[PDB]
Symmetry: C2
Subunit: 193 residues, 2 copies
């Protein structure tokens, strides 16, 4: 019944876990808090404003490794950043669908800027350091998305090792492959690689 | 008014491009074809059956490079397969959202099996050849998804080179990085890499 930001958003995240992104409405949020719809409207205008606040709040509560610890290799920052980002997207139902559907904040802009400054200090062109950051992102996003949504011979043995883990092993493997693809490009420079 | 598979699905894809995935309903599909709702029900039971048919049909019409040409390197198959897959996901609005939301077919199983047979013939463990295929997939999916949904100093110069292209350059860069990460692992074997 206390109707400020933090309580509105607390309750919205609790509901998202019950209903998912599609089943989340202003009407249902209002009932959960035990108030009238016009009352909520004063605080939260529409579904779109609610999702944008939620996207941002998920990352703020849980993407705890968004920026590099002092004197860490870029490889290691890309790695821990990917892991942290995946975990935060996984802490809530349809988390990745919530993140996808929003344009970035200015909190975000300051971070992408700080991370993009990091990457260049370790010798990336701007182009490349951003292509790097974006590939890690994209890869991490598709992987989380498939995990969150969900017989021939060799398949049968592969489909096994998918369903022994929760999806972490494949993600972490493909991750290292990506990072190492970048080293080999960074190190190359202006030779034929 | 001819109400068979191919016409139902033709019309559904035409509507998907007008309305998107959320705005796509049986009620609206029925009107487009100019028939009653119960009539459609005979042919298409619910929204879920329609999306599953659509996912499969998109890939069948357009993922034209799903399997390797004779005597092609695995690198090159991973590359062309990723490109083809991205293009098919991009030919329709919310294409990637349609693909995501379905479990795979048996057409699909035969292909993942044939591709997974390919990968092992070129010296991948089953584990690894599937981790490879899945990373290319995941990466390709997140990238398409962000493209389909959509100011500090260094950002300003990066945000430029994103919006000069349609997203192809970043995708193709990150792609090669991934593939090369796999070579370096395949070639390694049982040494410390």
């Amino acid at each position: 019944s206390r109707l400020n930001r933090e309580s509105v958003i607390d309750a919205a995240l609790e509901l998202l876990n019950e209903t998912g992104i599609d089943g989340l409405t202003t009407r249902k949020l209002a009932q959960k808090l035990g108030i009238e719809q016009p009352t909520l409207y004063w605080h939260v205008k529409n579904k779109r404003a609610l999702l944008d606040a939620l996207a941002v709040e998920i990352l703020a509560r849980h993407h705890d490794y968004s920026l590099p610890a002092a004197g860490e290799s870029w490889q290691s920052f890309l790695r821990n950043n990917a892991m942290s980002f995946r975990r935060a997207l996984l802490r809530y139902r349809d988390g990745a669908k919530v993140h996808l559907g929003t344009r970035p904040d200015e909190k975000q802009y300051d971070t992408v800027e700080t991370q993009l400054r990091f990457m260049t200090e370790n010798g990336f062109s701007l182009r490349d350091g951003l292509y790097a950051i974006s590939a890690v992102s994209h890869f991490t996003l598709g992987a989380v998305l498939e995990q969150q949504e969900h017989l021939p011979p060799l398949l049968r043995e592969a489909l096994q090792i998918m369903d022994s883990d929760d999806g972490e092993q494949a993600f972490l493997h493909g991750l290292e492959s990506l990072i190492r693809g970048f080293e080999v490009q960074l190190t190359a420079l202006l030779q034929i690689v």
